[PDB]
Short mmCIF file of C-alpha atoms and ligand atoms in Angstrom, two decimals:
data_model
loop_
_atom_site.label_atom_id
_atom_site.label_comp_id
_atom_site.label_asym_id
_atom_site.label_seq_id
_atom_site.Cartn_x
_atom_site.Cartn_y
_atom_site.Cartn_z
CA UNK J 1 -23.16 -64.68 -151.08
CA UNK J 2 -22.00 -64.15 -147.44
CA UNK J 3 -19.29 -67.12 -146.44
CA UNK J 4 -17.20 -67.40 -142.86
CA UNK J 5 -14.03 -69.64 -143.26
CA UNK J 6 -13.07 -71.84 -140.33
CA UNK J 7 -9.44 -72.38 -139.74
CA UNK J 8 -8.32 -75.86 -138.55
CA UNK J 9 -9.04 -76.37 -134.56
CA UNK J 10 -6.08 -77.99 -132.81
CA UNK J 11 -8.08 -79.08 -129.79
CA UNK J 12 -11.79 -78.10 -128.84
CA UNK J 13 -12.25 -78.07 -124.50
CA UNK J 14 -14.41 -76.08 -122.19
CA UNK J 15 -18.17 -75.60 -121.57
CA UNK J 16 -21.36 -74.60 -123.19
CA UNK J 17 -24.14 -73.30 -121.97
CA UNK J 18 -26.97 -74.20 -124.35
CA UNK J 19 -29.81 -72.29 -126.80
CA UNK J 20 -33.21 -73.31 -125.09
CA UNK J 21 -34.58 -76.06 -127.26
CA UNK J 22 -36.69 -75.42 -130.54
CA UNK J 23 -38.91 -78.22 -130.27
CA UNK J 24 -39.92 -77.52 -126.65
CA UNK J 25 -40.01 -73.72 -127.23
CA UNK J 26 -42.65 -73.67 -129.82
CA UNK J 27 -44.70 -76.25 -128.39
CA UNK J 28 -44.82 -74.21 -125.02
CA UNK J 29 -45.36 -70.55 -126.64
CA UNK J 30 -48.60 -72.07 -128.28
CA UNK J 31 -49.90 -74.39 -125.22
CA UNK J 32 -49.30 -71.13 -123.05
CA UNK J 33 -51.43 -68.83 -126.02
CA UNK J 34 -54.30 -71.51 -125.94
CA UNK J 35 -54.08 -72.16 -121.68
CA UNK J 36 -56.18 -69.75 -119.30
CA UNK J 37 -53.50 -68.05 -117.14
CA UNK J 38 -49.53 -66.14 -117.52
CA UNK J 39 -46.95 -68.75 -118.10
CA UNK J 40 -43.44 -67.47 -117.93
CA UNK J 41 -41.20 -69.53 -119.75
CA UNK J 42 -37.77 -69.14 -119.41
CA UNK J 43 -34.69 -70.46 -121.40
CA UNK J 44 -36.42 -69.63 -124.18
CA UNK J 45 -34.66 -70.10 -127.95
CA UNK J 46 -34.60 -66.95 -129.64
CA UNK J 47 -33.59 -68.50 -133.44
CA UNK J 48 -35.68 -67.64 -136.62
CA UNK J 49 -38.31 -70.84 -136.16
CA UNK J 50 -39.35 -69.31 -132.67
CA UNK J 51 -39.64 -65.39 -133.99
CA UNK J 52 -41.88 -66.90 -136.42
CA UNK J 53 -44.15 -68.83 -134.24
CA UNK J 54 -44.17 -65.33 -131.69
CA UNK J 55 -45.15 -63.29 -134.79
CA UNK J 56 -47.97 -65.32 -135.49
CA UNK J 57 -49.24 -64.72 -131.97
CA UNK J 58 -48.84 -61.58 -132.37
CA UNK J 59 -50.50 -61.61 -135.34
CA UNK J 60 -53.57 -63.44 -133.83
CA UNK J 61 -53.74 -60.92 -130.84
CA UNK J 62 -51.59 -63.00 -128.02
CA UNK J 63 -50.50 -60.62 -125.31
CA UNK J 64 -46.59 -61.57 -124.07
CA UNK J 65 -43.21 -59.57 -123.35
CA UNK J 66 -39.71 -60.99 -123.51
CA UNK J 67 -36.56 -60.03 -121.93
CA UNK J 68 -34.03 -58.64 -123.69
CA UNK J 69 -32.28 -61.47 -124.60
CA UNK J 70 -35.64 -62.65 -125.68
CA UNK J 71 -35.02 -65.87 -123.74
CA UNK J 72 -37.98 -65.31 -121.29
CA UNK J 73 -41.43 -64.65 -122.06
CA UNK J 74 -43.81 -63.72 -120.17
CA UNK J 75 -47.46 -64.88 -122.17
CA UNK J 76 -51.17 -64.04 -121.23
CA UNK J 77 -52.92 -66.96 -122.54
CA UNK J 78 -55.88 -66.96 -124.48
CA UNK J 79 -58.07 -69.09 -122.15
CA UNK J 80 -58.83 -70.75 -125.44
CA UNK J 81 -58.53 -71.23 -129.28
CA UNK J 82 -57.27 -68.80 -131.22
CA UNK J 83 -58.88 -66.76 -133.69
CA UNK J 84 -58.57 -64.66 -136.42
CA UNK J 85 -60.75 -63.80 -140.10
CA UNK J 86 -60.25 -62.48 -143.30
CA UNK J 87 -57.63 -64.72 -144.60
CA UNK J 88 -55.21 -63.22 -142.08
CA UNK J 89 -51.95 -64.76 -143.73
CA UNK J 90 -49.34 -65.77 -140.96
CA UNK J 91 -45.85 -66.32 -142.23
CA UNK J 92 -43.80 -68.78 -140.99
CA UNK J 93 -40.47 -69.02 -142.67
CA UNK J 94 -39.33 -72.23 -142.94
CA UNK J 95 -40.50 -73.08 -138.77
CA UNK J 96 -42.65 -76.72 -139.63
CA UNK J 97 -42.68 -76.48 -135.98
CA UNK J 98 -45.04 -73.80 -136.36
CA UNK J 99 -46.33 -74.45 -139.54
CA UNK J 100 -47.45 -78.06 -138.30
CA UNK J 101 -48.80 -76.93 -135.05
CA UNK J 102 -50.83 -74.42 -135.82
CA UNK J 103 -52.52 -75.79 -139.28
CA UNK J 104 -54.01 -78.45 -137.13
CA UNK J 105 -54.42 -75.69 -134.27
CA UNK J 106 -56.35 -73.24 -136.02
CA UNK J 107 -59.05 -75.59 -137.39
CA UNK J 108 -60.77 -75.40 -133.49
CA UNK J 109 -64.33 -73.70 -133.92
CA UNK J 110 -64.39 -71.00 -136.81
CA UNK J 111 -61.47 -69.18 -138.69
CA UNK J 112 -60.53 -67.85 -141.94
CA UNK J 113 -56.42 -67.81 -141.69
CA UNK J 114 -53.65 -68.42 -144.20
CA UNK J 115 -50.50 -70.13 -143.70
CA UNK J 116 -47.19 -69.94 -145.66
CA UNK J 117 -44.08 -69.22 -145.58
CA UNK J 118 -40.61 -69.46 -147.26
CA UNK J 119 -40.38 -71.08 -151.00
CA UNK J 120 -38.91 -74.30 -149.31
CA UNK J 121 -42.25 -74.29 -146.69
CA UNK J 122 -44.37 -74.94 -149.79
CA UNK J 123 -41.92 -78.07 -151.02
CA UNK J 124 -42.27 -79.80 -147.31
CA UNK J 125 -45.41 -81.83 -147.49
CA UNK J 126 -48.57 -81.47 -144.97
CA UNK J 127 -51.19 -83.34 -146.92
CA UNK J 128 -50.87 -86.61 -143.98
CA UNK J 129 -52.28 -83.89 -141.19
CA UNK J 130 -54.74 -81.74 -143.68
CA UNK J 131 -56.42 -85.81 -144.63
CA UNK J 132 -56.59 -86.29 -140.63
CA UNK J 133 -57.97 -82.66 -140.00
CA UNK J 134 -60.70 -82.73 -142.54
CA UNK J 135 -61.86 -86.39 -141.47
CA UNK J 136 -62.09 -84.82 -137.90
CA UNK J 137 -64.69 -82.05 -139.64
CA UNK J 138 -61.91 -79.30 -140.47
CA UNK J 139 -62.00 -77.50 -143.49
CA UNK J 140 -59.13 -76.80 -145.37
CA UNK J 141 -58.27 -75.50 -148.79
CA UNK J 142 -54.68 -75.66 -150.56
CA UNK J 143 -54.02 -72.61 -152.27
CA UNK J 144 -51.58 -73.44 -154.31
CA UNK J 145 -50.18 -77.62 -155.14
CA UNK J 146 -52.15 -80.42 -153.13
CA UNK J 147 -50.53 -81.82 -149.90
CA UNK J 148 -48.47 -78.85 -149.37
CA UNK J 149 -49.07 -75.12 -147.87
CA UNK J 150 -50.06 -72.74 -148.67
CA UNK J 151 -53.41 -73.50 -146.85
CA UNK J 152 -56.64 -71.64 -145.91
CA UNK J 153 -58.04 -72.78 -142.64
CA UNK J 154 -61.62 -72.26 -142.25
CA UNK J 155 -62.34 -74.22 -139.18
CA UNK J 156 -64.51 -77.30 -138.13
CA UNK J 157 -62.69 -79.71 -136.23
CA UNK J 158 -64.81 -80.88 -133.74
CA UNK J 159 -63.44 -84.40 -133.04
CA UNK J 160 -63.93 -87.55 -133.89
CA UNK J 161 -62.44 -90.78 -135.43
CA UNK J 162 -59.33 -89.50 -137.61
CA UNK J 163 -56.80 -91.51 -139.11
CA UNK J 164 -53.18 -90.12 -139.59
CA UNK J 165 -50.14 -91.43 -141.38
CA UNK J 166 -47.16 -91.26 -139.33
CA UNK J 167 -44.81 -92.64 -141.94
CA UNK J 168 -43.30 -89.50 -143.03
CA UNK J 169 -43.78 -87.28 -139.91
CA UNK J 170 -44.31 -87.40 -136.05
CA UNK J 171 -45.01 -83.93 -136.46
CA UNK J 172 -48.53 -83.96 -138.27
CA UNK J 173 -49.83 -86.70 -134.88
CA UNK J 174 -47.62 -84.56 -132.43
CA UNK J 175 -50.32 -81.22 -134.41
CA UNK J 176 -53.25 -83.73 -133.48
CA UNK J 177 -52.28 -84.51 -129.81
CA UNK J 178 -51.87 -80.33 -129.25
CA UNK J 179 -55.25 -79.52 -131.08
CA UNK J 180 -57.42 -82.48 -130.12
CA UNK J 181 -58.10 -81.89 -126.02
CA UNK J 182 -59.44 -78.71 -127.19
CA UNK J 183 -62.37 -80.00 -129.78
CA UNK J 184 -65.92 -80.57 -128.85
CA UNK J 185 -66.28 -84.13 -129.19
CA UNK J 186 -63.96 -86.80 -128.00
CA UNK J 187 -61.28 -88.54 -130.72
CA UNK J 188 -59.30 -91.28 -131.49
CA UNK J 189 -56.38 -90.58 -133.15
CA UNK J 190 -55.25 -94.41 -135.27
CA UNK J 191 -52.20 -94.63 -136.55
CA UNK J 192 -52.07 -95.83 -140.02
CA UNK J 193 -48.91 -98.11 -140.25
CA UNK J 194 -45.47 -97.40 -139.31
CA UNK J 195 -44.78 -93.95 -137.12
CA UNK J 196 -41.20 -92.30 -137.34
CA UNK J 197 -39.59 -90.10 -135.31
CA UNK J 198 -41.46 -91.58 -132.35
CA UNK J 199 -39.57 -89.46 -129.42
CA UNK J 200 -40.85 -85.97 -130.47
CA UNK J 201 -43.71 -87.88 -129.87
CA UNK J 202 -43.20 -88.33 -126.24
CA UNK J 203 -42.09 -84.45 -126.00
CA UNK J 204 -45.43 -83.63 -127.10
CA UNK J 205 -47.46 -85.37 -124.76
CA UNK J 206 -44.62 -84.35 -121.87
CA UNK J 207 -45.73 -80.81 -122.68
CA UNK J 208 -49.32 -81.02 -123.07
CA UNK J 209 -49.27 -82.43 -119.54
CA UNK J 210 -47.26 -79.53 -118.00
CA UNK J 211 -49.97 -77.54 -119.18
CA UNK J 212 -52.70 -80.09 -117.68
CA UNK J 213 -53.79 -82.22 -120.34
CA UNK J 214 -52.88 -86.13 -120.27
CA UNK J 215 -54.63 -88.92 -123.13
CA UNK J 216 -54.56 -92.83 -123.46
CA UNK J 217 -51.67 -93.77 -125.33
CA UNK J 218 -52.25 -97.12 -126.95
CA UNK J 219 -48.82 -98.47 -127.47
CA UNK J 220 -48.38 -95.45 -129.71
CA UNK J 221 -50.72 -96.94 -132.25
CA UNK J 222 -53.92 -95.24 -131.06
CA UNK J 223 -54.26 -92.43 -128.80
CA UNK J 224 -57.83 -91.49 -126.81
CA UNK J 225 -58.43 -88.37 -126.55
CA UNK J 226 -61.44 -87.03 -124.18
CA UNK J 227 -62.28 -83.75 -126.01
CA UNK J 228 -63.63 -80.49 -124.03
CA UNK J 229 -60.80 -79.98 -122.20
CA UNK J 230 -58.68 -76.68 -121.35
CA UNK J 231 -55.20 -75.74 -121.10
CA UNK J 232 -53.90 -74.50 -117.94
CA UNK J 233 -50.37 -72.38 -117.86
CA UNK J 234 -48.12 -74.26 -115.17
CA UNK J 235 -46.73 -70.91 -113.97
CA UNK J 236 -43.10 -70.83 -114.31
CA UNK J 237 -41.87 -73.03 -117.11
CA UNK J 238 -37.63 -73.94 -118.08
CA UNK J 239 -37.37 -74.50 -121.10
CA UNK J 240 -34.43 -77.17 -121.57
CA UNK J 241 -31.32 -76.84 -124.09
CA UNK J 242 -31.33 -78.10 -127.31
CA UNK J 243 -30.00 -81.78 -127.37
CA UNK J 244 -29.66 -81.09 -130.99
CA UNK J 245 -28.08 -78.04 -130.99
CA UNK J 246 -25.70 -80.14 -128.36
CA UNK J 247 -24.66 -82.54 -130.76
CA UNK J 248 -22.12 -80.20 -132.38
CA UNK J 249 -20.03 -79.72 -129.63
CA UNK J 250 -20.33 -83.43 -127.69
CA UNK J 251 -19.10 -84.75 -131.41
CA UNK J 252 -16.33 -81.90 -131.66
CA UNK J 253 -15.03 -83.56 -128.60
CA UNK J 254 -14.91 -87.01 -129.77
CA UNK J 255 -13.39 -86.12 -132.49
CA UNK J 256 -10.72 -83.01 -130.67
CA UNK J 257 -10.89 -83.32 -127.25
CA UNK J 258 -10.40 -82.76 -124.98
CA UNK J 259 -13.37 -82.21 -123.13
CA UNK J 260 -16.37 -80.72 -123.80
CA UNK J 261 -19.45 -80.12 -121.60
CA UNK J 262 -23.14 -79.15 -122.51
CA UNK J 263 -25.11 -77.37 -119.84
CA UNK J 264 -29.28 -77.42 -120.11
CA UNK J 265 -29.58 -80.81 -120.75
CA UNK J 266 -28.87 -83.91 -118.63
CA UNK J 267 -30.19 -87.60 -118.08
CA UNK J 268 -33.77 -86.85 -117.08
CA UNK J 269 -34.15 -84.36 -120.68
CA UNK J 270 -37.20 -85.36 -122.87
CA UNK J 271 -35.61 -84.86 -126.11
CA UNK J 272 -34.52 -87.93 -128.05
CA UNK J 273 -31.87 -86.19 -129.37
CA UNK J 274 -30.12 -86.69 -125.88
CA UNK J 275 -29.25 -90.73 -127.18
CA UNK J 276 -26.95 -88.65 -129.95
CA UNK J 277 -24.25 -89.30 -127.00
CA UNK J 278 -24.81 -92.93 -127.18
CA UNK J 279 -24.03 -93.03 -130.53
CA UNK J 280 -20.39 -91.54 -129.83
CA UNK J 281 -20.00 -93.63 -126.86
CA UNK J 282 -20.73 -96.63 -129.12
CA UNK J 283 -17.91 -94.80 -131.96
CA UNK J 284 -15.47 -95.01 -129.15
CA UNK J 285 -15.82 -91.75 -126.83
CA UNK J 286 -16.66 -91.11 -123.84
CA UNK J 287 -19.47 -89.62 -122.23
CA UNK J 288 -20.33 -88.34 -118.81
CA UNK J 289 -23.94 -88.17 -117.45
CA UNK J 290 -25.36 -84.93 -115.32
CA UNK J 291 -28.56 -83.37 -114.06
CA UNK J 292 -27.74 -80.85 -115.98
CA UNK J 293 -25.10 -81.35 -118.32
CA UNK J 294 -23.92 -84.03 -120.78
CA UNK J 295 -20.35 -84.08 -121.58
CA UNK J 296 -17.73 -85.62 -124.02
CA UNK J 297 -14.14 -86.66 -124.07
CA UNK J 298 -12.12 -88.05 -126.72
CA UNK J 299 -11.48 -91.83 -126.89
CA UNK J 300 -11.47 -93.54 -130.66
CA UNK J 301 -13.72 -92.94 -133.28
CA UNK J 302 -14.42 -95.76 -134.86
CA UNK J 303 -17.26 -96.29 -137.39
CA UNK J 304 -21.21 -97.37 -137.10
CA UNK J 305 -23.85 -98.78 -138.89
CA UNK J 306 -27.04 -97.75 -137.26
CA UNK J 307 -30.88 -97.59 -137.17
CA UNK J 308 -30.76 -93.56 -136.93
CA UNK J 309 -34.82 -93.17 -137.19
CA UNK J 310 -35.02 -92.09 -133.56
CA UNK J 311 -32.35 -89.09 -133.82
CA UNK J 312 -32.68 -87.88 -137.57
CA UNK J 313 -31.56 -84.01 -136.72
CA UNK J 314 -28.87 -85.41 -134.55
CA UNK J 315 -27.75 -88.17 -136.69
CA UNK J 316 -26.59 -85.73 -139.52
CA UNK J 317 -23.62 -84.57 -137.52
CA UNK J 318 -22.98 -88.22 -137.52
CA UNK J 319 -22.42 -88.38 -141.59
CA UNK J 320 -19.41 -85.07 -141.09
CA UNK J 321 -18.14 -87.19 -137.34
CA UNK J 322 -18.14 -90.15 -139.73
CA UNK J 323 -14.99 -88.26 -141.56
CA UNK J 324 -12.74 -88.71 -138.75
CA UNK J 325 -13.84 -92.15 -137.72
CA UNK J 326 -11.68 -95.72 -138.70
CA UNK J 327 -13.96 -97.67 -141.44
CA UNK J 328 -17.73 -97.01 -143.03
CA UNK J 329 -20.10 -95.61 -141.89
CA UNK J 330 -23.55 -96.16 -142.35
CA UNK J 331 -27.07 -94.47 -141.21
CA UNK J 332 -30.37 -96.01 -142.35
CA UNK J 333 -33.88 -95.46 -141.90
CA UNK J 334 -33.21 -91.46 -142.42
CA UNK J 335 -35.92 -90.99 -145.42
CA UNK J 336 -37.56 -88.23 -144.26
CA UNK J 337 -34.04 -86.11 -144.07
CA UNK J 338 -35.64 -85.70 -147.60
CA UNK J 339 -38.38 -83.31 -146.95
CA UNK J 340 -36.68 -81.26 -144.15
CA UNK J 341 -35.20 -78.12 -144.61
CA UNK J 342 -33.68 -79.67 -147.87
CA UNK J 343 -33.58 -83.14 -149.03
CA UNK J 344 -30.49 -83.85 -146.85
CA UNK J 345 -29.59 -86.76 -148.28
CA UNK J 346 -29.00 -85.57 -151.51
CA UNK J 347 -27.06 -82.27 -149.56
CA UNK J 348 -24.86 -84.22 -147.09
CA UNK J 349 -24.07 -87.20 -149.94
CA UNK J 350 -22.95 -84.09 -152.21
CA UNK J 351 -21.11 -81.52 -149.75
CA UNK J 352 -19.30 -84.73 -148.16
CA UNK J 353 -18.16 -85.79 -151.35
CA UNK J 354 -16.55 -82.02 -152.00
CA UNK J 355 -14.08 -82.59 -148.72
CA UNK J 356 -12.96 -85.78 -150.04
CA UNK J 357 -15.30 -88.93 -148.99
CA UNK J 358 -16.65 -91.92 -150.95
CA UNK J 359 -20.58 -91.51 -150.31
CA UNK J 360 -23.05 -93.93 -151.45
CA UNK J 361 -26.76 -91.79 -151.17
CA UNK J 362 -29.13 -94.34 -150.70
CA UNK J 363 -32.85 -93.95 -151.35
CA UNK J 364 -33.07 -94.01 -146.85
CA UNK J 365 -29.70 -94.43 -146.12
CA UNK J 366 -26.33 -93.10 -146.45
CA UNK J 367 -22.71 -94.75 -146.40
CA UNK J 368 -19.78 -92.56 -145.83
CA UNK J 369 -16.30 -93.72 -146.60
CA UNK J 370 -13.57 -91.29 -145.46
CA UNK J 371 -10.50 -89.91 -147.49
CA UNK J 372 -7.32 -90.76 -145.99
CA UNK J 373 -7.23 -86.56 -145.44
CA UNK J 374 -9.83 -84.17 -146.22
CA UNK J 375 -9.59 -81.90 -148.40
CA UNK J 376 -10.58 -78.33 -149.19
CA UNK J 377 -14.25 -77.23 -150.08
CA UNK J 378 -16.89 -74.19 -150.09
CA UNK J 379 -19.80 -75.70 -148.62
CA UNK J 380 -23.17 -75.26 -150.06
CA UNK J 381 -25.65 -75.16 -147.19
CA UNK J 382 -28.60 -75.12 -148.67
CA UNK J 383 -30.68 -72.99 -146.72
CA UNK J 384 -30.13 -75.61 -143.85
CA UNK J 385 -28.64 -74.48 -140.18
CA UNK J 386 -27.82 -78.13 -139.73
CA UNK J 387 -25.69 -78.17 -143.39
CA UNK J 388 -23.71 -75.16 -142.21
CA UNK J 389 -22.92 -76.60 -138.09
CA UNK J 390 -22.14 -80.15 -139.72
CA UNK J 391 -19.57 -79.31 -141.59
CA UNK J 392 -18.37 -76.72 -139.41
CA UNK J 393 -16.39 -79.68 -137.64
CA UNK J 394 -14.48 -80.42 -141.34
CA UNK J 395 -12.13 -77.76 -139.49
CA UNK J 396 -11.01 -79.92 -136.78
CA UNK J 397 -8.41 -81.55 -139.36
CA UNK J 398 -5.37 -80.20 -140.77
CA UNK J 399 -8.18 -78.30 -143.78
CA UNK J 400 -9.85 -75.03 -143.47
CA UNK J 401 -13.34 -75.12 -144.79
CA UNK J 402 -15.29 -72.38 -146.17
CA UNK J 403 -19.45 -72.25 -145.08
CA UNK J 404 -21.63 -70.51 -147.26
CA UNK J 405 -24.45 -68.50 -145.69
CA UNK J 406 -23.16 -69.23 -142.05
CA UNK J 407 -26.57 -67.02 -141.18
CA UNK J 408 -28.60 -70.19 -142.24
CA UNK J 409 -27.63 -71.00 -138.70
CA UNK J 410 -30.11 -68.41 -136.97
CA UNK J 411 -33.00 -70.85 -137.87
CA UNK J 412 -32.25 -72.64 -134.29
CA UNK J 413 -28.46 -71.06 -133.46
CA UNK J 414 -27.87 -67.86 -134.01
CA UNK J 415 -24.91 -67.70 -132.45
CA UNK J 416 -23.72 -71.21 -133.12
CA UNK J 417 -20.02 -70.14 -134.66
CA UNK J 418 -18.99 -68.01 -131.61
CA UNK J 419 -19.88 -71.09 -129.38
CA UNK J 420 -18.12 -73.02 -131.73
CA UNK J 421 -15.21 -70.97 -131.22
CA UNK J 422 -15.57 -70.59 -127.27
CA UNK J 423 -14.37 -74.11 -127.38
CA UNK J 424 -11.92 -74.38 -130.10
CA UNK J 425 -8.13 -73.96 -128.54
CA UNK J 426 -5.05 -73.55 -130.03
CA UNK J 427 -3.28 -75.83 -127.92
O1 S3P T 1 -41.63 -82.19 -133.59
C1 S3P T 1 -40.48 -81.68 -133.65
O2 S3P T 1 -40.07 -80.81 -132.89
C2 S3P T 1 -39.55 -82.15 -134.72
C3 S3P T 1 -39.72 -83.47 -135.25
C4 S3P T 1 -38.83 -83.99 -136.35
O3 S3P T 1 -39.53 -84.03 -137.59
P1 S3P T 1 -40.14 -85.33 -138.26
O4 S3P T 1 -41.18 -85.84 -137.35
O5 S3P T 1 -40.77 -84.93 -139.56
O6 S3P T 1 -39.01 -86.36 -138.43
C5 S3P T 1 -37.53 -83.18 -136.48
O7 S3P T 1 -36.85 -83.63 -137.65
C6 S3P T 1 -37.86 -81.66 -136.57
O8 S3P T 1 -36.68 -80.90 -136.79
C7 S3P T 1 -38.49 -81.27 -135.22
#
């Protein structure tokens, strides 16, 4: 078991320049695959989830080149849907970002293709999008327990009326919106009840028009979709930073600043996870608005008790800022932190426990009372990058803390603990 110990960081100040975002990233590389034309996208993330979602491009027979920091890719799209036969099995780690897209993806026209991936992969349910993709004529087998992949695609989608459930995932609609332009027949995508993490919805449909497809959103409880429609690459495309990957550093500063500045992302970004800085504004720092950069400097920290359904990935860092803060803090509406990369609520109730809090783990909720000084812990990370970069900031006390797998990081930040310690100073 590899482990990287972090000792305490007096003050953290300086700049970042950050990882191209995962969300956009693997949304783009398969919108350019499926579009007629090269799109070069640049600012790229090179992390695990997007290697996986490039090898399965490969693997179907996509022509692209990246740099050598792999951050710009240069794709030949497909003009098309993508095809493959013989139960070609495409691996996708743990990347539901692939895993999501292209189950709904590969259903266009005909296709015999396997998906899987890690042992976790086959614990994170898909069963909402599979129900939606088989009432819109897709075809689609699980291999192994029901609701989750594996799965054998065989094809069929051609449209249609489809319900979805959006309760547990904006991820199985946002595999819809992608796949739907592309069918046959027109469809109308109904949401069933409630829909959760609502602004990856809006980065879907942001993308899907760069690469010239737009559809009726009704109040984002129906969405009209005219179907026969093609992709077209936009040319040049910048990828922005990760606004989650940001929220590790603009929280380091509110809680040792300081000053700290994110480059890549700004007012005008399309990722939800750019409100993450209103939450620490509302805690007591302060925050400075760009074009291209978001920045932090320490105020107060004083504690919350928020709605957190709109930032889930972000929010986390919230539960190990919550530490540092005056008073209790608590995060609700956060169920589906269960069937992420681990359940996360269990995880960040049980490693924040180890440093010293009082943590109530709610069924949807969490409620973090801080020690009067932390304490030393090994962290258990649980396969998780996010685990491992929360409680990275345990070390801005008077504590060390010891990470397990700090490599967990590469999912989305591969080199997330020399950024880490760009900004951490001495003095
Ligand atoms: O579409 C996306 O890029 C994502 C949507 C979210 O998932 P849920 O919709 O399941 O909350 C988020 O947690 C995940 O890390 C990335």
């Amino acid at each position: 078991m590899e482990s990287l110990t972090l000792q305490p960081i007096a003050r953290v100040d300086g700049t970042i320049n950050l990882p191209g975002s995962k969300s956009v990233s693997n949304r783009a590389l398969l919108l350019a695959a499926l579009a007629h034309g090269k799109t070069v996208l640049t600012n790229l993330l090179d992390s695990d989830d997007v290697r996986h979602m490039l090898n399965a491009l490969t693997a179907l027979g996509v022509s692209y080149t990246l740099s050598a920091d792999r951050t710009r890719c240069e794709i030949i799209g497909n003009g098309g849907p993508l095809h493959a036969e013989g139960a070609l099995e495409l691996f996708l780690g743990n990347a539901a970002t692939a895993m999501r897209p292209l189950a709904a993806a590969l259903c266009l026209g005909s296709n015999d293709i396997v998906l899987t991936g890690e042992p976790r992969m086959k614990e994170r349910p898909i069963g909402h999008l599979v129900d939606a993709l088989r009432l819109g004529g897709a075809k689609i087998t699980y291999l192994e327990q029901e609701n989750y992949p594996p799965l054998r695609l065989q094809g069929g989608f051609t449209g249609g009326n489809v319900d979805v459930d959006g309760s547990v995932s904006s991820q199985f609609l946002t595999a819809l919106l992608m796949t739907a332009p592309l069918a046959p027949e027109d469809t109308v995508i109904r949401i069933k009840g409630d829909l959760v993490s609502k602004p990856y919805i809006d980065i879907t449909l942001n993308l899907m028009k760069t690469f010239g497809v737009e559809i009726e959103n009704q109040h984002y409880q129906q969405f009209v979709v005219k179907g026969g429609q093609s992709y077209q690459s936009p040319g040049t495309y910048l990828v922005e930073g990760d606004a989650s990957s940001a929220s590790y550093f603009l929280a380091a500063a509110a809680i040792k600043g300081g000053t700290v500045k994110v480059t890549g992302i700004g007012r005008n970004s399309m990722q939800g996870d750019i409100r993450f800085a209103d939450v620490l504004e509302k805690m007591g720092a302060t925050i400075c608005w760009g074009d291209d950069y978001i920045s932090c400097t320490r105020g107060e920290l004083n504690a919350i008790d928020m709605d957190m359904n709109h930032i889930p990935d972000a929010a986390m860092t919230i539960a190990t800022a919550a530490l540092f803060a005056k008073g209790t803090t608590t995060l609700r509406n956060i169920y589906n932190w269960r069937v992420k990369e681990t359940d996360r609520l269990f995880a960040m109730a049980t490693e924040l426990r180890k440093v010293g809090a009082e943590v109530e783990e709610g069924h949807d909720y969490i409620r973090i009372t801080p020690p009067e000084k932390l304490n030393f812990a090994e962290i258990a990370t649980y396969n998780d990058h996010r685990m491992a970069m929360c409680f990275s900031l345990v070390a801005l006390s008077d504590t060390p803390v010891t990470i397990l797998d700090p490599k967990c990081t590469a999912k989305t930040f591969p080199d997330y603990f020399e950024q880490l310690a760009r900004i951490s100073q001495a003095a």
